[PDB]
Amino acid sequence: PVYVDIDADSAFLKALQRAYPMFEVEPRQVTPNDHANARAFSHLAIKLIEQEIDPDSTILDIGSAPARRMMSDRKYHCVCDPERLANYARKLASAAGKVLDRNISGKIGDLQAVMAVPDTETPTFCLHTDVSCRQRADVAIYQDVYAVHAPTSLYHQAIKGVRLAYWVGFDTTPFMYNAMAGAYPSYSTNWADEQVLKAKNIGLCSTDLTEGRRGKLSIMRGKKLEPCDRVLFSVGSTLYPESRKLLKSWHLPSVFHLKGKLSFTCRCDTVVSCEGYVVKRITMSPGLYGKTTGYAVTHHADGFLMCKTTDTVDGERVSFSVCTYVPATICDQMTGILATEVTPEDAQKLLVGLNQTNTMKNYMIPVVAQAFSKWAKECRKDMEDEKLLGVRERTLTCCCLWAFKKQKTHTVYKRPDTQSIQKVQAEFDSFSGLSIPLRTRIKWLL
Amino acid sequence: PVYVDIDADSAFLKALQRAYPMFEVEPRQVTPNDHANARAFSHLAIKLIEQEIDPDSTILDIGSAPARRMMSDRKYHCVCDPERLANYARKLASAAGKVLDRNISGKIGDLQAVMAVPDTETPTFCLHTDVSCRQRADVAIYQDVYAVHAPTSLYHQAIKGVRLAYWVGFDTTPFMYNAMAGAYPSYSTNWADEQVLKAKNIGLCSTDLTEGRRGKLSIMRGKKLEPCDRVLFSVGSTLYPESRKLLKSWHLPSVFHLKGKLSFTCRCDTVVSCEGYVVKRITMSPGLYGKTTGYAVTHHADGFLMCKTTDTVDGERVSFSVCTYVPATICDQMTGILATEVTPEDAQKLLVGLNQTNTMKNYMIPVVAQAFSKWAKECRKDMEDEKLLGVRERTLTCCCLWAFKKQKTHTVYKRPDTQSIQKVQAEFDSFSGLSIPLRTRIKWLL
Amino acid sequence: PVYVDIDADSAFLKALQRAYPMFEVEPRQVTPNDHANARAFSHLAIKLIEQEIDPDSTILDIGSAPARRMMSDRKYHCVCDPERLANYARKLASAAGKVLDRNISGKIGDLQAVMAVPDTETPTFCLHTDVSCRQRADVAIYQDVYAVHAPTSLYHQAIKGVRLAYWVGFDTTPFMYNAMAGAYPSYSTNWADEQVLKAKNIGLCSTDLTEGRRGKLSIMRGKKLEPCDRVLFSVGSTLYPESRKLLKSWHLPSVFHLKGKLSFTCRCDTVVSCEGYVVKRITMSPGLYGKTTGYAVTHHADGFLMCKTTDTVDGERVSFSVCTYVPATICDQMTGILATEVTPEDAQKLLVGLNQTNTMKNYMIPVVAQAFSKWAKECRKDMEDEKLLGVRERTLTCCCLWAFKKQKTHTVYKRPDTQSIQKVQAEFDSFSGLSIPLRTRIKWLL
Ligand SMILES: Nc1nc2c(ncn2[C@@H]2O[C@H](COP(=O)(O)OP(=O)(O)OP(=O)(O)O)[C@@H](O)[C@H]2O)c(=O)[nH]1
Ligand SMILES: Nc1nc2c(ncn2[C@@H]2O[C@H](COP(=O)(O)OP(=O)(O)OP(=O)(O)O)[C@@H](O)[C@H]2O)c(=O)[nH]1
Ligand SMILES: Nc1nc2c(ncn2[C@@H]2O[C@H](COP(=O)(O)OP(=O)(O)OP(=O)(O)O)[C@@H](O)[C@H]2O)c(=O)[nH]1
Ligand SMILES: [Zn+2]
Ligand SMILES: [Zn+2]
Ligand SMILES: [Zn+2]
């Protein structure tokens, strides 16, 4: 009943079936898409969201195209590109008379009204931003949108009567850990900070061959390579610029409060989670009931690794943090060997032996190996420097100020069935692009 | 007859069938819920409680929502949030005429009456707290509520006529042992003290990568790391703040007395106990019959561990207690190897060998190994420092005061078929949140 | 024909079938009860007692509730609490008309008469103590009651016409041996002296984690750790306070005499004995025929162990006696290796090898191993220090007083098919709790 454009022999099919046990996921490959897993997950997410909400509900579809929202019986108001709008108009024109069970005549009239007056708020389409839109609804969908501030957009939806919001996208946990780069290997996705795009051995990088004869000159002293706001995502071959702050804003706590002219008590729950791709359900309710701990929890069905790795960016040897997702079976099969101190070479050989058909992508096997090795070493150190129960050894420094020694932590390894917990903000109170040729082109197809 | 939203191949299905032999537990997975085991246990607990109590009984449903109690033939008066109330109203409106065997018309009238006047005490719903509620009933249910003071709530229910109360929730034994952190691994649950949330190797923590170059300073001197009242539970990805005193208050003794204007003799018995999740039955009777020993007993079907562990909280190497549950088969299979002194590495290798499908979650295996190792060592010490029968070696210290030497106890290991016994209090005598927009929203659906 | 609430795969089914060969014991598990074995044994004991005594007999049921004694055709005068009384009233009200073959109308009238005048001695119910009761009967049943003085209760029953009494409960032999703690592993039962409740490695204990840095001070000098009267039993999760003297009083000799206003010659025989749970038959006959040796004999179908063990109570390393029951097959399989001196570690490894499904509970395996080891050592000493036949080496000490050397006895091992014999007393001549709210509650259901 639900068909996914993936190969029938894909190992991701089992994971996607586990993530959606309510459907009968059937592989029907029609394209060689290199980010087919992400598309299949997003399609299944949209099907699940539609199944969850009432049929009589109007759905704000933030940051999307109506072309993919026309073959449905739900009232999708698509508020968010020119190519996608042209495709939506073309699909309207090519199905104007073939089927009439999707309000295609009404959608065509709505599009004509919008292209007539761009400020029109027709029930099925809008050209304003999620902030500038004023079409009241009760359900909001955020499918693969990351360049919007989460509390601001959620508040602007809530004041329009939206009580339920859905966010589909990659897990925000790697950016709350503040990794320099990282991978969602199951979805062929690699993201990197703009500063490390010239690296060598990460997922999303390109470097040139050099002999290292001349030491490159720079007008500025770096002396610090820590993550900056700009990041680049590559889902298959699709490139997307993102902001770290806008990504982290979507790492919402379990409870938060939007205070303004109207106040809302909102709850964020991750309802779907498959190998780095999450569907979060946000329930908004007017009022300021309860209290907020400002804590966001990410459960880990699969292992999550943030490891220090040494690469060469533009030929310069540097060290930075790299995140990755390790399959739960690989993490479980490494439990015994991580009891002792294992070298990265032995860890990598063991991972390759356990990966034999590959359970996990091999390009992350080396760094993961390093991570595991470091983790094991660190654990041994923790077992070799056992302290006393309920005491600390902070020393006085010439004043009333007390200081302790921080240990070398080169690996954060969240094993399967663990939970990462982050201190985030839970109280928020700080909340015309149409052109003549595009209008002419749209009208020519209507 | 009883269907649980868990995978048909779940190893927890056998344990849940064992915990509820009276029902035919059938796995019917419909959601990918990451805390599905806890939900299934709670659903089976509610089914068993309903089966136990008389059909003609009024049930006080404390700290819950009626959005999960309408599809029953039993008079559930729900006293305890905004989204859950909205879901209750939605479910009443969507099934107002479809089914008329659940007093849905009466429930809708009661909800409208409560909306008209928030102090109304309709037989099926109330908006007050359990203290503020005054609807007389004979049965109380405490499903997954831990933020209430147990003797106070029980007294306020008893003076309302409640003779039978049921408490469904995680076992309170770990908090009677004063563990800093702990796991209910079977339910994908990890709880941690707020102080150790920045740890590295516990179930519920998040730490950053550091080089240990700058020693972090602090305004105040810690010098002590003992559990504080504030703890955080993560059931799957669901985050709940809890108070240690409120959690311990529900570790009631077998017999206790509530003394006040009316006096009650209450008995607390654990009627269901599956791998860290307990259903407790409290029978309250007016009068002060008998005497109270002030002892609470927990039977351990599976192994219970509280072990000293060394981790890094915010990079500072510290030691604190961590609790966990070990499957009884794992504990029995470790009996022979614990006869000698085993290193944590060998213990972890043996545990991994015994875990081969995993009997226990692997993320608990390392610390468990440490615990077992320490336990073995301690036992050997006890066998190497054999004292004389019925004598003690307390020495005199310059006065009439006698002192003895305490031994290093780094592991409390309650084996399967053992009982932990705690001295608790057994004599107790020290016993308007509605908003206009919520009222309008609820009334819009009625 | 007799159904027991235990698992069909329970290994206790075979033992219970052997203990009751006259019944067809069928496992019908309906509850996950952690002390299901003890309940099944007690139910079979009551069935056998009923099958033994004549149908025309009135049965005094001492220290019990009628909520378990109405579904029978035998006249049960229940003399003994509030919750059980309410349960009995509820069961009477819920079966008043459905079944009329159990004299339920008469039972209801009797309960109403007792609630009218609390001194009434209705044939089927009483509110007085077993001493204050005056309803004549010929059969008395003491099911799981240990807080009454055995000769006093037996005499007060005998002067009321009781010629036959039945006592069902845990074997009193461990308390005649004066063990500090002990286990009935087959019934998931662990008992401990109040002083050793803060132990670490016994069945019923709880201790905390300590670094053993500060030596705890005490106002009093212990200098002795001997059993005190107060003990605590844990049957599964059910906690019972008990008196050592009251428990020992039920370790009656095979023949004893109750002398007073009326004199009786009584005989105590253990008619059922399963792995620590016994049913004793006491036959009372007026007159003082015969003579009493003052000896109580316990036959051991399975091994009984009282061994010195070293634990830490509240961190203090102490040694005290621990008792346990070892399966006869384990004891027989241990005969060969006990011919030599075996270490506790080797003994524990061998016991684990023999326990492979576990024949015995694993948490008793270590101490038992120690026991066995010590026993073997002691036996070797007895063989290495062979004396002369019919001579003793008592030495004179500056007086007419002779002294011998007592040997180290750290293990009492009563093997299967042996008998312990204790010197006990055999000549005994030293022999209003109702509340208004309870009366109103009972009357409301009648
Ligand atoms: N990081 C990031 N990923 C995105 C973003 N938008 C979409 N994606 C993901 O990247 C994939 C590529 O997007 P598209 O080229 O539009 O593919 P599509 O969404 O299936 O639609 P088509 O173009 O018709 O195939 C999508 O499947 C999304 O899962 C974005 O803004 N940021
Ligand atoms: N520690 C703790 N656990 C809780 C608390 N409330 C509920 N839980 C458990 O955590 C799980 C998550 O709660 P919910 O998100 O409400 O799930 P639910 O109770 O099954 O109801 P739904 O949201 O409809 O799924 C529940 O299954 C409970 O077993 C709480 O207050 N404290
Ligand atoms: N040591 C000791 N054990 C007891 C005593 N009374 C009962 N027991 C045992 O402990 C078990 C627990 O008692 P209960 O909770 O009343 O269980 P029950 O007798 O089967 O009756 P229910 O409560 O209906 O299950 C019983 O099965 C008895 O075998 C007692 O006074 N002292
Ligand atoms: Zn719009
Ligand atoms: Zn109410
Ligand atoms: Zn009587």
Author numbering:
A (entry chain Q), B (entry chain O), C (entry chain M): 3 to 82, 89 to 364, 376 to 450, 458 to 472
What does the publication say?
Each nsP1 protomer is built around a methyltransferase fold common to SAM-dependent methyltransferases with additional insertions (membrane binding and oligomerisation (MBO) loops 1 and 2) and extensions (ring aperture membrane binding oligomerisation (RAMBO) domain) that contribute to pore formation, oligomerization, and membrane binding.
The guanosine base fits in a hydrophobic pocket defined by residues D152, Y248, F241 (β10-11 lid), Y154 (β4-αD loop), and F178 (β5). Base stacking occurs in between D152 and Y248, where the latter residue changes rotamer relative to the SAM-bound and apo structures to become planar with the guanosine. The overall effect of this deeper binding pose compared to canonical N7 MTases is to align the alpha phosphate of the GTP with H37, a catalytic residue identified to form a phosphoramide bond in the m7GMP–nsP1 covalent intermediate.
